[PDB]
Design a protein around this ligand. Sequence first.
Ligand SMILES: NC(=O)c1cccnc1
Ligand SMILES: [Zn+2]
Length: 208
Amino acid sequence: GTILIDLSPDDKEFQSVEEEMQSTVREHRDGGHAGGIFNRYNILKIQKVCNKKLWERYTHRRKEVSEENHNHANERMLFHGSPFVNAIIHKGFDERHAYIGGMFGAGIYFAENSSKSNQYVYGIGGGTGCPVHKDRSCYICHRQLLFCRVTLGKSFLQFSAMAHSPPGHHSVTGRPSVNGLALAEYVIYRGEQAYPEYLITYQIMRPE
Ligand SMILES: NC(=O)c1cccnc1
Ligand SMILES: [Zn+2]
């Protein structure tokens, strides 16, 4: 049931999504080990992901959460990186997309920093890098990220350097406590609490 609609680079919607991608790149403490060495991307394509069933599954859950949280879904737009973006856009998020070994337990992980999600595109810790060249810093191969609508509801705040949400909460927020420049990461424990809105195809760019 999924169709992908290409956005024109002239469309304000393309431009706002690209700006969120580019403006949330940061340096990582691994020196580029997992995700590569880059300060910016070459955006090749941005597609809107359209699936009625998956959208309705999302809005159903969103209303449930809103009703448990004084009519506030606490909805965010966040990045997700995974080798399984094709499964996600066709069948939705579910327990197979959970990061069993993550810092906040076995849930589905989303990032404010696009460059954090980039570290997961080829697998946990970058896996072995791109399929073709086995390079986690590949500047040739096309990568894909999802920019997703995520319902946080009442989020459990973890200060730091499928499972269930903490009791009385709908998500977990991982607040950076060491790296002053890192943005937050978020975990949900129900696939229906995220919709994969945009599929972004890109390359990382070699610094000049
Ligand atoms: N898979 C991801 O995009 C991700 C986001 C935030 C933290 N860890 C992983
Ligand atoms: Zn490559």
